[PDB]
Design an enzyme around this catalytic site. Structure first.
Site, short mmCIF file in Angstrom:
data_model
loop_
_atom_site.label_atom_id
_atom_site.label_comp_id
_atom_site.label_asym_id
_atom_site.label_seq_id
_atom_site.Cartn_x
_atom_site.Cartn_y
_atom_site.Cartn_z
N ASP A 96 0.87 -1.17 0.00
CA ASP A 96 0.00 0.00 0.00
C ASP A 96 0.91 1.23 0.00
O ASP A 96 1.72 1.41 0.90
CB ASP A 96 -0.89 -0.02 1.25
CG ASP A 96 -2.23 0.64 1.03
OD1 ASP A 96 -2.30 1.75 0.46
OD2 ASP A 96 -3.23 0.02 1.44
N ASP A 197 -2.95 4.70 -2.44
CA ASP A 197 -3.88 5.37 -1.56
C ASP A 197 -4.20 6.78 -2.04
O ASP A 197 -3.29 7.60 -2.27
CB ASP A 197 -3.27 5.40 -0.16
CG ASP A 197 -4.21 5.95 0.89
OD1 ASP A 197 -5.19 5.27 1.22
OD2 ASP A 197 -3.95 7.05 1.43
N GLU A 239 -6.38 4.00 -5.93
CA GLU A 239 -7.67 4.18 -5.24
C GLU A 239 -8.21 5.50 -5.70
O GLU A 239 -7.64 6.54 -5.38
CB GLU A 239 -7.51 4.18 -3.71
CG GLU A 239 -8.84 4.37 -2.98
CD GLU A 239 -8.69 4.95 -1.58
OE1 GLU A 239 -7.59 5.45 -1.23
OE2 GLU A 239 -9.69 4.88 -0.81
N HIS A 314 -11.18 -2.37 3.50
CA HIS A 314 -11.06 -1.95 4.90
C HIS A 314 -11.77 -0.64 5.24
O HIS A 314 -11.78 -0.23 6.40
CB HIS A 314 -9.57 -1.81 5.24
CG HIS A 314 -8.88 -0.69 4.53
ND1 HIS A 314 -8.64 -0.68 3.17
CD2 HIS A 314 -8.38 0.48 5.01
CE1 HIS A 314 -8.04 0.45 2.84
NE2 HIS A 314 -7.86 1.16 3.93
N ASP A 315 -12.38 -0.01 4.25
CA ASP A 315 -13.04 1.27 4.44
C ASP A 315 -14.54 1.18 4.30
O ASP A 315 -15.22 2.16 4.46
CB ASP A 315 -12.55 2.30 3.41
CG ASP A 315 -11.12 2.78 3.68
OD1 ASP A 315 -10.69 2.81 4.85
OD2 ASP A 315 -10.45 3.12 2.71
#
Ligand SMILES: [Ca+2]
Length: 537
Positions: A96, A197, A239, A314-315
């Site tokens: 990430d 990210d 993302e 995870h969000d």
């Protein structure tokens, strides 16, 4: 064909995957100890959420050292061993990459904070007050202003996330090169690529109130590609919450030399009130979900772009709880979502625990919540006089902690995640929802995922076939073909918890279903969440 076109990616959230040393926190050796399981499932790469040194204000997305492993996960030796062991299992590691902002404990910011003439000052974004207030009205994603006042200098610094995530100044050429050099350190270790990210923010221009999708975004990513991974044969996935299908092509067209693909989030706003926040709830219209699913299959030009496919990360909450049924139709519903996505065009991503139908974990009060995003919303809205019950409900429907509950391995203490109290408590439903139980049951959600992955690995039509919508079905029914040369597969899915009519003149041979297999589809009544894949004859 580049390896990731054919791949299935699995996201591990490391704090919550597997504790191996008894501190209640998942760690790298824990992930290593579960590589046999992931190979059994058949995944090709792990997207590893951040394991870098981090104060943890945003659970690892506030990084204080890009080239150090946070001691709560182990050491660099453990990271190297995971890469090496994973490779032996035919699994690449995708790291990430969080380069829009750093921790306020990153050395660069500790330095910049010292004063206007520090050499690192311009690594971040500093602005004078305007009319004795913030430079402008830009907001943080964790409530409040995107501008944090610094007393000593008398200037504000920009943070689109937490106060403790100061935003990096991408106009600074020295900083861009340091970022590139750091990326090359990780690339040299044999990783399979990067998940990037909020990468759509790097063209930000706050003076013009530009956040996502700024002018310099694509020029920076082309520069980045050349300086780092451009010749490396790795997968890069950005993302991009605000990507449209056209913008996704700009990111993913191989002739643009940017990224492999992007995560788009168009369907996320389907269950919030227009013009408001995700916390302002409204029921999902299945027809709108269908339209968004179809749009991204048909309006992307796959000759000049690629596409990612996901339901979970995870969000965001668990998809079966949010948009489906996680009670007596749990198994069928989970299988339906898996089937309709994994037979689509693009690279699928499976979030840890999705493959066994892990559900949301409701809370009764705020002291059960850890995530800054939820807490900050709760406190602000409480102060503003919102109904506290509805705030808890909003967290239960949209809160990120639902995604972060410990992975459920078995029916032992803490679901086998840990022998001590986990950093975040285990969902009480682990007794019936766990990996051991799913592996013991051939009709389990896990074998549906395993089968879908195998189908993709072994049938080019799943990888490169065109998508073609079956016309004129009910809003609650999604049916489509994949077509490769003279071969044609039909997918039929009930998106709803109630019976739906479906009509077709296709003659079929069924390959996979979440109900007993059918031998025709001339005029049928789909059971709740009924979904299946058929060869068209
Ligand atoms: Ca641990």
């Amino acid at each position: 064909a580049s390896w990731w076109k054919n791949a299935v990616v699995y996201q591990v959230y490391p704090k919550s995957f597997q504790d191996s040393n008894g501190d209640g926190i998942g760690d790298l050796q824990g992930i290593i100890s579960r590589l046999d399981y992931l190979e059994k499932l058949g995944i090709d790469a792990i997207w590893l959420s951040p394991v870098y040194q981090s104060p943890g204000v945003d659970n690892g997305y506030d990084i204080s050292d890009y080239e150090a492993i946070d001691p709560q996960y182990g050491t660099m030796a453990d990271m190297d061993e995971l890469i090496s062991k994973a490779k032996e299992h035919h699994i690449k590691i995708v790291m990430d990459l969080v380069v829009n902002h750093t921790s306020d404990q990153h050395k660069w910011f500790v330095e910049a904070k010292k004063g206007k003439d520090n050499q690192y000052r311009d690594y971040y974004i500093w602005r004078d007050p305007v009319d004795e207030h913030e430079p402008n009205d830009l907001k943080s994603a964790f409530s409040g202003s995107a501008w944090k006042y610094d007393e000593r200098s008398g200037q504000y610094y920009l943070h689109f996330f937490a106060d403790q995530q100061p935003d990096l100044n991408w106009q600074n050429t020295e900083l861009r090169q340091k970022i590139y050099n750091m990326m090359n350190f990780w690339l040299d270790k044999g990783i399979g690529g990067f998940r990037m990210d909020v990468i759509e923010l790097i063209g930000k221009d706050p003076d013009k109130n530009i956040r996502e999708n700024g002018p310099m975004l694509h020029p920076y990513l082309q520069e980045m590609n050349k300086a780092t991974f451009g010749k490396r044969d790795v997968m890069t996935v950005g993302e991009t919450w605000n990507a449209t299908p056209k913008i996704a092509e700009e990111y993913s067209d191989p002739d643009r030399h940017e990224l492999s693909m992007v995560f788009q989030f168009e369907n996320q706003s389907l269950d919030q009130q227009p013009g408001k926040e995700k916390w302002d709830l409204k029921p999902l219209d299945l027809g709108e979900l269908k339209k968004v699913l179809v749009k991204w299959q048909t309006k992307i030009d796959f000759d000049h772009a690629w596409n990612s496919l996901f339901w979970e990360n995870h969000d965001i909450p668990r998809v079966i709880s949010r948009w489906g049924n996680d009670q007596e139709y749990r198994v069928q519903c989970a299988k339906m979502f898996a089937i309709i996505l994994h037979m689509m065009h693009g690279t699928p991503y499976i979030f840890n625990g999705e493959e066994i139908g892990m559900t949301n974990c409701p809370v009764k009060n705020i002291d059960e919540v850890e995530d800054i995003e939820s807490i900050n919303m709760y406190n602000e809205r409480l102060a503003e006089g919102y109904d506290e019950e509805e705030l808890i409900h909003a967290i239960n429907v949209k809160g990120r902690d639902n995604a972060r509950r410990p992975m459920q391995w078995n029916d032992e203490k803490n679901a086998g995640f840990s022998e001590v109290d986990p950093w975040l408590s285990v969902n009480p439903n682990y007794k019936d929802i766990n990996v051991e139980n799913a592996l013991a049951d051939p009709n389990s959600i896990f074998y549906t995922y395993q089968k879908l992955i195998k189908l993709r690995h072994e049938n080019p039509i799943v990888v490169d076939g065109d998508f073609s919508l079956v016309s004129n079905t009910q809003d609650a029914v999604l049916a489509y073909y994949r077509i490769l040369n003279d071969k044609k597969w039909l997918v039929v899915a009930n998106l709803s918890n109630e019976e739906q009519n479906f009509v077709s003149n296709d003659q079929i041979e069924t390959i996979l279903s979440n109900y007993p297999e059918r031998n025709n589809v001339q005029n049928i009544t789909l059971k709740p969440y009924e979904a299946f894949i058929s060869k068209v004859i």
